[PDB]
Amino acid sequence: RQSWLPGSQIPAHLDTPAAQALAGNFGFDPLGLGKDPVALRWYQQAELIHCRTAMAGVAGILIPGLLTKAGALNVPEWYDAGKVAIENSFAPWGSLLAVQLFLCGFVEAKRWQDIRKPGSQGEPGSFLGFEASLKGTSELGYPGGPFDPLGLSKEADKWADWKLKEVKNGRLAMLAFLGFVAQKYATGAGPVDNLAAHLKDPWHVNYATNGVSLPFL
Amino acid sequence: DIAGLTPCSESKAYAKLEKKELKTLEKRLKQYEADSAPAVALKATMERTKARFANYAKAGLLCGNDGLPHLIADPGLALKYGHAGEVFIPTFGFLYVAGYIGYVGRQYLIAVKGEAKPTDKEIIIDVPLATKLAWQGAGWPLAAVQELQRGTLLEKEENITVSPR
Amino acid sequence: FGIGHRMQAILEAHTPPSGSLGAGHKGLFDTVNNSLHFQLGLALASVGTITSLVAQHMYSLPPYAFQAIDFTT
Amino acid sequence: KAGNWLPGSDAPAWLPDDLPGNYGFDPLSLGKEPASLKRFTESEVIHGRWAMLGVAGSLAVELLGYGNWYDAPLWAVNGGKATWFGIEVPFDLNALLAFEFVAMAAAEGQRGDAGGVVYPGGAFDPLGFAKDSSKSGELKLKEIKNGRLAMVAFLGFVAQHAATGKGPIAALGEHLANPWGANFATNGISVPFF
Amino acid sequence: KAGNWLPGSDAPAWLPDDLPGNYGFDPLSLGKEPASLKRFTESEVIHGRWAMLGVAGSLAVELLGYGNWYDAPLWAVNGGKATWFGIEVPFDLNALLAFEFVAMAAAEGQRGDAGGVVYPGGAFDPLGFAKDSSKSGELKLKEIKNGRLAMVAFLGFVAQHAATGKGPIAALGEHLANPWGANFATNGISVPFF
Amino acid sequence: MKDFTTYLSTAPVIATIWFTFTAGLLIEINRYFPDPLVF
Amino acid sequence: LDPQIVISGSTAAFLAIGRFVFLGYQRREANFDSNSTIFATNDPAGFNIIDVAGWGALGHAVGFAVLAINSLQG
Ligand code: CLA
Ligand code: CLA
Ligand code: CLA
Ligand SMILES: CC1=C[C@H](O)CC(C)(C)[C@H]1/C=C/C(C)=C/C=C/C(C)=C/C=C/C=C(C)/C=C/C=C(C)/C=C/C1=C(C)C[C@H](O)CC1(C)C
Ligand SMILES: CC1=C[C@H](O)CC(C)(C)[C@H]1/C=C/C(C)=C/C=C/C(C)=C/C=C/C=C(C)/C=C/C=C(C)/C=C/C1=C(C)C[C@H](O)CC1(C)C
Ligand SMILES: CC1=C[C@H](O)CC(C)(C)[C@H]1/C=C/C(C)=C/C=C/C(C)=C/C=C/C=C(C)/C=C/C=C(C)/C=C/C1=C(C)C[C@H](O)CC1(C)C
Ligand SMILES: CC1=C(/C=C/C(C)=C/C=C/C(C)=C/C=C/C=C(C)/C=C/C=C(C)/C=C/C2=C(C)CCCC2(C)C)C(C)(C)CCC1
Ligand SMILES: CCCCCCCCCCCCO[C@@H]1O[C@H](CO)[C@@H](O[C@H]2O[C@H](CO)[C@@H](O)[C@H](O)[C@H]2O)[C@H](O)[C@H]1O
Ligand SMILES: CCCCCCCC/C=C/CCCCCCCC(=O)OC[C@@H](O)COP(=O)(O)O
Ligand SMILES: CC(=O)/C=C/C=C(C)/C=C/[C@H]1[C@H](C)CCCC1(C)C
């Protein structure tokens, strides 16, 4: 049994056969937020959405930032890309956010309805024939049809491992974005610049030297 | 600006009040020596006064005709004119700590309620269980919302005692 | 003279269909017309509210001549 | 049932299947009581009919060039005379109130005395398009759907006028000229923080 | 079936063999249900017919020297008059949308009221090219294949225009004049690293 | 020691220790952050 | 504005909507609303003197309101 703390008392709610079926089960729940099975299922969906969203965002911040350091691209910093992208644009940020909220609300409402009732999106005569493809697999949060065009989820032997590479990576991405924010309020530069400045002198450039992360020192 | 008030960084009464406080402190300081404990204490108080006035003017507070700051309690005005730090953020901070303490106490009561003698657990606090619940109460809003959605937060009408009407 | 209303009918015809108020105002005409303490309580509540209204309106909106200059009054 | 307003959600039990426009949309459970649901049906049909006529009139006046629906009663407030289709009308505001009040009182009085009738027929159907009750089902749905759409359209007319100051056609032309740059998120009234 | 899209891969078990243009290409399994497959079949045939007409019209108008397909509604952006084959047309954009909308709505309503008929025939087949059902299936394969090619061609038209700016005929001549110097890799937006 | 810990676990002793800890935390917070009126 | 025309028209109009429009509704509500005097009349629809006085009062009030509003010149 893999654990996040060797010797710590693993919670009973995380030891059930249903809880162990989730990917990345390391028995980490010191606050007991997953005692309720309904709450655990909802939080599992939230963790999956956060993992995918954080992975896409951190990728869109790290890859163009790494290409900017080289001569591949000239993408500005993530904390300044919004202003630069809205300057020479075709619409203000308010109109764009309104269209975004509408388009995101529709799909999130459909996802919410499928979470409330699995496979309910396949109601006949409701999506111009595309309702059949809107029914996900047996596991919540893992749909097929239009999603997953390559069909890599049909092989079960790697499926259980595939999900492990999706949650864990996502968790890392979730911390990555957090660092991106903290570093922004601690050094004032970008993440790639902070990485290079740290690699230049690791013994004197860290969180214990900026004076912000350790005010008592 | 809002309600006919002016910012503390541009109020004459605010500066006059600061000069009055510094004047009375300096007047009290002139009666002592230079390398004595009361003089150092008075200088420290004066530095604290200067830092307090500078910080209040730096925060963008709105002062009145008396030179004293004013708080904005309307959420719209606070979030629209940069006054959310006065009454909005501390409101949510107190809500978090209040629900935190309430949830910890409720969890302790429900936990000791099923034991043999709950009154002993009430007069003599079970420090290990109380400490565990105190550390676990960080997720109080999530646990409270999940409890409310499940219907286990409230007790039924038939299980509560009432008057004979 | 035939025309007009009956307070009992208006009271008995004011119950929401959702059952939020229970039986609504059914039987309120008999419990008020036959109880002098209920009528006295309603009258005193309205009178006290009107008295406070009088105090506020008279100091803010002076109705009598040369009344604002008289501070003691 | 014509359809499902929330794909994958169970329809309310108090809503009949043969009701026109029955999409199962009632989160507040307002039609749970059978008597209340009966009044709400005729109320919705009457509202849809009035809104359809109102939206058609507001569109026709601006499409022909006689101002918007908001500028229509502006003649009675500052020395003006009503013009219908470019023809002068010899009636003051006081005379219009008496005639409209008497006519509407008579019409609505007969309708109310009828007993909540939603589909009168007969004298109201001179062309006989709903003689058979078997084919009236596919035509009643069209009426309720067009009525709901016109209700939303009139509400939008009032909202866009109160938030911009221009008529319905004027807001359409401006939006067709600049869709991304001129919408509800750019008027400064709808969303204040945008 | 007309063949296999991916050699070595088995065709899906829900695709009928008698369907025209059946290549077993369905990795997303969108036509899993027979009800959705019928609608998608009619939609694909109609899309192919419209794509064929659109591609033929764009190529014809560009080869006849009447501008590219992108500069077709440009006369109604700045104010002008449309010219079909060099002959002036006195209809403006406001009147063109009305007649086209009315005629298209009537024709599409009549077509959709039949219940999704893909191959009507009769009045639409006066020459009798499909009198015998033995050879009717062979021409259907050609029809769906030409439609698929036309849809891909129209997608290519839009993509190459948004990537370069020149029209389909102007892009063909440019590519024939400089194949290594004028292609999808030299436009500048397909590959940002190059 | 069990009886001593049980005595220290009573309501007045626990209240005294808890209020002393809370008061000390608030006092030290105001000491290192003098005059906090806003956030 | 002529006072006679306005008052006469308002009174006649409300008496007409009281006798030919809202008579049945008022009679049905008065019946369900449940020493006295019965006012017998020869009107076929039972429009007694009490209803005439009430409708005439409403008509006169509305007519005088119209006259006053038009007198204000607004
Ligand atoms: C606890 C009671 C309470 C009271 C007495 C008020 C009172 C007020 N609020 Mg409010 N508000 C409250 C709770 C309260 N609020 C809460 C809990 C929230 C969080 C949702 C808000 C969020 C809020 C916002 C975002 C705004 C106000 C605003 C206002 C002021 C005018 C609007 C109004 O009266 O309509 C009641 C307020 C609401 C129903 C909230 C929606 C805002 C309405 C639609 C007004 C917006 C229109 C426009 C901006 C008005 C400004 C006109 C002009 C000065 C430019 C007014 C003094 C407005 C303001 O003055 O901006 C500085 C403003 O925009 N409030
Ligand atoms: C588990 C602790 C607890 C909880 C969850 C509540 C909760 C509640 N109380 Mg209550 N109360 C408590 C303890 C608690 N009380 C105690 C010890 C007293 C005696 C002083 C009171 C006296 C009291 C009165 C007179 C009233 C309430 C009321 C209420 C309700 C309104 C909210 C409020 O803040 O009121 C105010 C809360 C207080 C005045 C006391 C708070 C005391 C602390 C902060 C609570 C925790 C103390 C405890 C020692 C910690 C647990 C230790 C454990 C972890 C080892 C609410 C449901 C009101 C009501 O009737 O309901 C609408 C009301 O009128 N309470
Ligand atoms: C019949 C529905 C309808 C239509 C066709 C329009 C059309 C239009 N409106 Mg309008 N509006 C509507 C309803 C509608 N509105 C309603 C109900 C309200 C009150 C909330 C408003 C309030 C409003 C304001 C304040 C403004 C407009 C404006 C405009 C114009 C610019 C687009 C825009 O930003 O609007 C936005 C409309 C909404 C956010 C609400 C639309 C309601 C639904 C979502 C649309 C109809 C449903 C649609 C047929 C199918 C939806 C499916 C989809 C969600 C997937 C445009 C021509 C702006 C203008 O004047 O132009 C410069 C303007 O400022 N509208
Ligand atoms: C488990 C648990 C339980 C127990 O009981 C207790 C405890 C301990 C408490 C716990 C823990 C928790 C945690 C840690 C959490 C966290 C989370 C996160 C971090 C998230 C994020 C998350 C994150 C996310 C999503 C993110 C996303 C992002 C994005 C979109 C981005 C975007 C962008 C880009 C691209 C670029 C531009 O230029 C900018 C922007 C616009 C900005
Ligand atoms: C269903 C439900 C149930 C659940 O449970 C809950 C909820 C959600 C709440 C719901 C919903 C609701 C809603 C939405 C409502 C709305 C309505 C409307 C809009 C109406 C209108 C309606 C509307 C209407 C009638 C309108 C009408 C109009 C008119 C007549 C007009 C007139 C006119 C004209 C001609 C023009 C001129 O120049 C002026 C005038 C004179 C002015
Ligand atoms: C099958 C499947 C299944 C699996 O599983 C999955 C997936 C992959 C999803 C799939 C695939 C899909 C696809 C490929 C699609 C595509 C489509 C298209 C492209 C269409 C178009 C389509 C297209 C179209 C109609 C087009 C049309 C056009 C037109 C009419 C044109 C017109 C015109 C002309 C003459 C020229 C002038 O100057 C202008 C105009 C006036 C403008
Ligand atoms: C027999 C007969 C008949 C009838 C006739 C007649 C002619 C009747 C009538 C009647 C009338 C002709 C009535 C009227 C009336 C009136 C009244 C009843 C009134 C009143 C009053 C009041 C109450 C007022 C008040 C006031 C004042 C004092 C001041 C200012 C304000 C007001 C205006 C409010 C006929 C031929 C149809 C048919 C046959 C038989
Ligand atoms: C902005 C201008 C437009 C706004 C105008 C609003 C004016 C509304 C006037 C309402 C007048 C009430 O008028 C009266 O209504 C009742 C109540 O339904 C109708 O009453 C009818 O339906 C009710 C049930 O609802 C039955 O009990 C009754 O027997 C029947 O007559 C009457 O036939 C009508 O005479
Ligand atoms: C019921 C469920 C509700 C779910 C709601 C989900 C909300 C979706 C979240 C969206 C993220 C919000 C990000 C957009 C806001 C940040 C944009 C912004 O802050 O820009 C404004 C400002 O810089 C522009 O300033 P100028 O360029 O100086 O005008
Ligand atoms: C934009 C708008 O308002 C709606 C247009 C919808 C249509 C034409 C749908 C029509 C049919 C469909 C495919 C289902 C069966 C009946 C119809 C008329 C053939």
UniProtKB/Swiss-Prot annotation, chain B:
Keywords: Chloroplast, Photosynthesis, Photosystem I, Plastid, Thylakoid, Transit peptide. One of its GO terms (cellular component) is photosystem I reaction center. The keyword Nucleus does not apply. One of its GO terms (biological process) is photosynthesis. It is found in: Plastid, Chloroplast thylakoid lumen. Its main location: plastid. Belongs to the PsaF family. Probably participates in efficiency of electron transfer from plastocyanin to P700 (or cytochrome c553 in algae and cyanobacteria). This plastocyanin-docking protein contributes to the specific association of plastocyanin to PSI. This is Photosystem I reaction center subunit III, chloroplastic. It comes from Chlamydomonas reinhardtii. The chain holds residues 63 to 227 of 227 of the full protein.
From Swiss-Prot, chain C:
It is found in: Plastid, Chloroplast thylakoid membrane. The chain crosses the membrane at residues 36-59. The PsaA/B heterodimer binds the P700 chlorophyll special pair and subsequent electron acceptors. PSI consists of a core antenna complex that captures photons, and an electron transfer chain that converts photonic excitation into a charge separation. The eukaryotic PSI reaction center is composed of at least 11 subunits. PsaA and PsaB bind P700, the primary electron donor of photosystem I (PSI), as well as the electron acceptors A0, A1 and FX. PSI is a plastocyanin/cytochrome c6-ferredoxin oxidoreductase, converting photonic excitation into a charge separation, which transfers an electron from the donor P700 chlorophyll pair to the spectroscopically characterized acceptors A0, A1, FX, FA and FB in turn. Oxidized P700 is reduced on the lumenal side of the thylakoid membrane by plastocyanin or cytochrome c6. Belongs to the PsaA/PsaB family. This is Photosystem I P700 chlorophyll a apoprotein A2. It comes from Chlamydomonas reinhardtii. The lineage of its organism: Eukaryota, Viridiplantae, Chlorophyta, core chlorophytes, Chlorophyceae. The chain holds residues 296 to 368 of 735 of the full protein.
Curated annotation (Swiss-Prot), chain F:
Keywords: Chloroplast, Membrane, Photosynthesis, Photosystem I, Plastid, Thylakoid, Transmembrane, Transmembrane helix. The chain crosses the membrane at residues 7-27. It is a single-pass membrane protein. The keyword Transport does not apply. It holds the Pfam family PSI_PsaJ. GO terms for biological process: photosynthesis. InterPro entries: PSI_PsaJ, PSI_PsaJ_sf. It is found in: Plastid, Chloroplast thylakoid membrane. Its main location: plastid. SUPFAM superfamilies: Subunit IX of photosystem I reaction centre, PsaJ. One of its GO terms (cellular component) is photosystem I. May help in the organization of the PsaE and PsaF subunits. Belongs to the PsaJ family. This is Photosystem I reaction center subunit IX. The lineage of its organism: Eukaryota, Viridiplantae, Chlorophyta, core chlorophytes, Chlorophyceae. The gene is psaJ.
UniProtKB/Swiss-Prot annotation, chain G:
The chain crosses the membrane at residues 5-25, 49-69. GO terms for cellular component: chloroplast thylakoid membrane; photosystem I. It is a multi-pass membrane protein. It is found in: Plastid, Chloroplast thylakoid membrane. One of its GO terms (biological process) is photosynthesis. Keywords: Chloroplast, Membrane, Photosynthesis, Photosystem I, Plastid, Thylakoid, Transit peptide, Transmembrane, Transmembrane helix. Belongs to the PsaG/PsaK family. Not yet known. This is Photosystem I reaction center subunit V, chloroplastic. The lineage of its organism: Eukaryota, Viridiplantae, Chlorophyta, core chlorophytes, Chlorophyceae. The gene is PSAG. The chain holds residues 32 to 122 of 126 of the full protein.
